[PDB]
Amino acid sequence: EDVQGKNCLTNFHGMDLTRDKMCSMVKKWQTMIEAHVDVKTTDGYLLRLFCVGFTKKRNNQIRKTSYAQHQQVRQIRKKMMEIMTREV
Amino acid sequence: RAKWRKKRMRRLKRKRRKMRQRSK
Amino acid sequence: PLAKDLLHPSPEEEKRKHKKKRLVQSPNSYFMDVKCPGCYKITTVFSHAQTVVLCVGCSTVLCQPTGGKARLTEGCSFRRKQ
Amino acid sequence: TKKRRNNGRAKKGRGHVQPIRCTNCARCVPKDKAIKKFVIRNIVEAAAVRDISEASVFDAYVLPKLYVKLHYCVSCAIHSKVVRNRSREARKDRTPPPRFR
Amino acid sequence: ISIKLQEEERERRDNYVPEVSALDQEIIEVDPDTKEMLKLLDFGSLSNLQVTQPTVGMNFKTPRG
Amino acid sequence: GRMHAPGKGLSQSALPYRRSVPTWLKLTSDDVKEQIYKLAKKGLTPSQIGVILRDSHGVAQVRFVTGNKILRILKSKGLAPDLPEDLYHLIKKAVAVRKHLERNRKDKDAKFRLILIESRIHRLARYYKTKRVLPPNWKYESSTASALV
RNA sequence: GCGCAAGACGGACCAGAGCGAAAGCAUUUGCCAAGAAUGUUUUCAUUAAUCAAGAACGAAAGUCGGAGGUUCGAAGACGAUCAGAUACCGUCGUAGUUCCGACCAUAAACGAUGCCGACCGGCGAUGCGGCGGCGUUAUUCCCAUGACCCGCCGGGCAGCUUCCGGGAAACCAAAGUCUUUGGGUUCCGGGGGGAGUAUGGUUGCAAAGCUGAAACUUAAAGGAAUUGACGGAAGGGCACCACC
RNA sequence: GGUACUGCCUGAUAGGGUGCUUGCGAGUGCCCCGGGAGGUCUCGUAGACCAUG
Ligand SMILES: [Zn+2]
């Protein structure tokens, strides 16, 4: 934003995950869950926050797949939304 | 081939529909 | 296999078979007698109970309805009748 | 004469599936039929690993991996030899090939 | 080839036995249910038995995938 | 299986063999009858009543207790619906579908389902004209449908 | 690299998984009405199965009006390849692809297998609801509830297996219960061509749709499987009359 | 009192994640302190993918 005479003042803009990590997470036998919120902070800054989550395979699990029913997914989604909204 | 002689048949039929008009 | 008494099934198996496919049609549900701890009153309740049942004076909610069975509120005792 | 019991596609109990674009071809094929091959490899390949490993500013820097989902129309696969035809009885076996030693 | 007497020599080699049978043990461990099936046969009084604790988790199966 | 649907299934009630009113039940036939009477005076259909009594008062089948099924008892005392309650229900449902289908015309599926419902109505009503529970000039009409319910 | 705009499209997750009468149907959130399965000691008391006439929906393309035009793109125009390419390849690019409102009613609309019902071998899987059951977890004890885990029951999509029996065979737990021939019903085929053409009728703005012959012609046309021979298919294999 | 172990992170020596030793697969070891010496830990090993007749 401001230049100090060979000093550059930098303010936060954005954040993201490395493509590699993103792909590394996604797999074929699990439900993926996503949500987002638009929140104004206390200083007025307006942020779109994205959230990604996954059904985890249980430790003794025999069944090949871990899938969440739609209502469960909606629930989790709602709670993510709630949480990060409250945080920011 | 079938599709094409069906098509050709519709061409011919349109042409016959032209050559014989209800005016004749 | 090739030998079975369709006449004398073992009671266990008959507990296993679907209610209509039994040698005689036997309802799988029973009338139960519910008692809330804080009161004396006894209440007759159907095993799988739709709606919601109440103890009159205490306004006690006995049970919530669910898909299969009504589920009683905690601490409330019950006895199958006969 | 019916060739496959499943008709080459995974479609059961549903009427129509979303069509997808071939990786190699651009030839339209339904997702069920499409031969899918997932590819997990390293961005830089075999020798340039040991090569670049030395030119790093970081210590114990692990090379990123490239992940690519591939769809091939039935033709292209048999061309690239990703899939090859087999005997009448041996066809019946849907157990994937032993890349696991 | 089957040579002869080599069926008799195998009758020699194959014939063997340790001083006591491996079937002889002062304590054999058995599951509660085995003891039940024995109790049906009125053998629930056998001396050599030791009832061993049943394993609490049930996993007998391979994790399909 | 189902008349208007593809599915074929088993979900139902199996009445026990003994028609004999069990021991613990403490209510008379008359008692039950009064209970039913006031419950009908609260605006309930025979099914509703049956359910209430089955749940709270431990009546397995009213029919075993009083010797008469519910609708006959009610119709005997003079309080009965003008049209049998199921026919009523179907009419009301069709009412709803109509009402929703006027705002959204692009809905194909609902139109389809409406037509199905109307068929069920016509079957039933035919059956009731033949059993003389309706005057046989009776006609279900799209316009006065909102009235009857 | 920073921003802006427009219209399309919802990747991966996505499966021999789900939902729908079938076409078909995947971003979030709410609103609106449906629906199967399940549960039920609720209610009506035969109201039911299949369907000429008649009606509802019906992919894509296509046609009329309107809006909109990013991508792709028939027509067209070039550039190439080619003996020749008005074709496969490539650059450009109209109608159309998109939304709204009226038509059209046809697909290899395919499980190439009408619908209702009864019976007939197993076996693991899965989806949905229910029932029961040690034990783990959501931190340490009590009940709920959820996640795994072990079964049972009823619907579903499927799978594997088998001298159930079929079948011309491929194959099929239905295509089984067929000369030991009869559970109910609708549609429908009669060698191949001629031809789904001619005509009349009928629907449509149009393209067409539905109904639909004959004269003549012809010993086969066809279906499964079997050995061959071939392939510009995939594999191996050999030879200094193949090479290194 | 007897008797075991003990990488890091979270939330217990439990539960849940995640590691290093040789590229891989085994072994082995990795809480704290003091002191002591002995040192290129051992055994295996495909890890190979850029027209006309
Ligand atoms: Zn291709």
mmCIF file of C-alpha atoms in Angstrom, chain F residues 19-94:
data_model
loop_
_atom_site.group_PDB
_atom_site.id
_atom_site.type_symbol
_atom_site.label_atom_id
_atom_site.label_comp_id
_atom_site.label_asym_id
_atom_site.label_seq_id
_atom_site.Cartn_x
_atom_site.Cartn_y
_atom_site.Cartn_z
ATOM 1 C CA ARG F 19 -60.414 -61.596 20.005
ATOM 2 C CA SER F 20 -60.860 -61.835 23.759
ATOM 3 C CA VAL F 21 -60.597 -58.582 25.705
ATOM 4 C CA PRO F 22 -57.648 -59.183 28.073
ATOM 5 C CA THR F 23 -57.660 -59.056 31.874
ATOM 6 C CA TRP F 24 -56.097 -55.745 32.889
ATOM 7 C CA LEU F 25 -58.479 -53.613 30.868
ATOM 8 C CA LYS F 26 -60.714 -51.829 33.334
ATOM 9 C CA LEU F 27 -63.108 -49.903 31.050
ATOM 10 C CA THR F 28 -66.715 -50.819 30.212
ATOM 11 C CA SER F 29 -68.129 -50.780 26.712
ATOM 12 C CA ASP F 30 -70.116 -47.707 27.787
ATOM 13 C CA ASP F 31 -67.052 -45.981 29.205
ATOM 14 C CA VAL F 32 -65.233 -46.408 25.932
ATOM 15 C CA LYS F 33 -68.360 -45.208 24.127
ATOM 16 C CA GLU F 34 -68.449 -41.907 26.045
ATOM 17 C CA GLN F 35 -64.737 -41.400 25.580
ATOM 18 C CA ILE F 36 -65.242 -41.856 21.871
ATOM 19 C CA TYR F 37 -68.258 -39.557 21.948
ATOM 20 C CA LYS F 38 -66.439 -36.552 23.373
ATOM 21 C CA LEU F 39 -63.359 -37.277 21.243
ATOM 22 C CA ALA F 40 -65.649 -37.050 18.221
ATOM 23 C CA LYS F 41 -67.030 -33.855 19.662
ATOM 24 C CA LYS F 42 -63.517 -32.433 19.321
ATOM 25 C CA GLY F 43 -63.585 -32.958 15.535
ATOM 26 C CA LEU F 44 -61.672 -36.210 14.930
ATOM 27 C CA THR F 45 -61.986 -38.944 12.306
ATOM 28 C CA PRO F 46 -62.471 -42.644 13.337
ATOM 29 C CA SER F 47 -58.769 -43.302 12.711
ATOM 30 C CA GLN F 48 -57.755 -40.478 15.111
ATOM 31 C CA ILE F 49 -59.961 -41.911 17.856
ATOM 32 C CA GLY F 50 -58.728 -45.436 17.268
ATOM 33 C CA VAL F 51 -55.164 -44.164 17.648
ATOM 34 C CA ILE F 52 -55.758 -42.130 20.803
ATOM 35 C CA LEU F 53 -57.483 -45.033 22.536
ATOM 36 C CA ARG F 54 -54.835 -47.510 21.414
ATOM 37 C CA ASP F 55 -52.092 -45.284 22.823
ATOM 38 C CA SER F 56 -53.275 -43.711 26.116
ATOM 39 C CA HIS F 57 -56.099 -45.984 27.356
ATOM 40 C CA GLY F 58 -54.660 -49.313 26.250
ATOM 41 C CA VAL F 59 -57.540 -50.291 24.013
ATOM 42 C CA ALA F 60 -56.226 -52.824 21.498
ATOM 43 C CA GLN F 61 -59.346 -52.859 19.315
ATOM 44 C CA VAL F 62 -62.432 -50.881 20.296
ATOM 45 C CA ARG F 63 -64.249 -53.415 18.149
ATOM 46 C CA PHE F 64 -63.565 -56.237 20.625
ATOM 47 C CA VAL F 65 -64.654 -54.129 23.593
ATOM 48 C CA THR F 66 -67.978 -52.655 22.439
ATOM 49 C CA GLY F 67 -68.958 -55.223 19.790
ATOM 50 C CA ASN F 68 -69.234 -52.381 17.263
ATOM 51 C CA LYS F 69 -66.585 -50.707 15.120
ATOM 52 C CA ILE F 70 -66.060 -46.977 15.542
ATOM 53 C CA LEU F 71 -67.800 -45.470 12.497
ATOM 54 C CA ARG F 72 -70.966 -47.470 13.245
ATOM 55 C CA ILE F 73 -70.980 -46.232 16.832
ATOM 56 C CA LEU F 74 -70.527 -42.649 15.747
ATOM 57 C CA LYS F 75 -73.004 -42.829 12.878
ATOM 58 C CA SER F 76 -75.443 -44.460 15.339
ATOM 59 C CA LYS F 77 -75.253 -41.583 17.792
ATOM 60 C CA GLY F 78 -75.692 -39.203 14.881
ATOM 61 C CA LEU F 79 -72.236 -37.650 14.643
ATOM 62 C CA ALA F 80 -70.613 -38.838 11.435
ATOM 63 C CA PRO F 81 -68.899 -37.079 8.538
ATOM 64 C CA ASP F 82 -71.105 -36.200 5.552
ATOM 65 C CA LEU F 83 -68.638 -37.905 3.239
ATOM 66 C CA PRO F 84 -66.432 -40.753 4.465
ATOM 67 C CA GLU F 85 -63.201 -39.329 5.857
ATOM 68 C CA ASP F 86 -60.763 -40.889 3.371
ATOM 69 C CA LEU F 87 -62.693 -39.480 0.407
ATOM 70 C CA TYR F 88 -62.597 -36.262 2.342
ATOM 71 C CA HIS F 89 -58.801 -36.516 2.734
ATOM 72 C CA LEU F 90 -58.194 -37.194 -0.949
ATOM 73 C CA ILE F 91 -60.443 -34.239 -1.867
ATOM 74 C CA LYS F 92 -58.423 -31.998 0.425
ATOM 75 C CA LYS F 93 -55.086 -33.173 -0.947
ATOM 76 C CA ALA F 94 -56.277 -32.546 -4.484
#
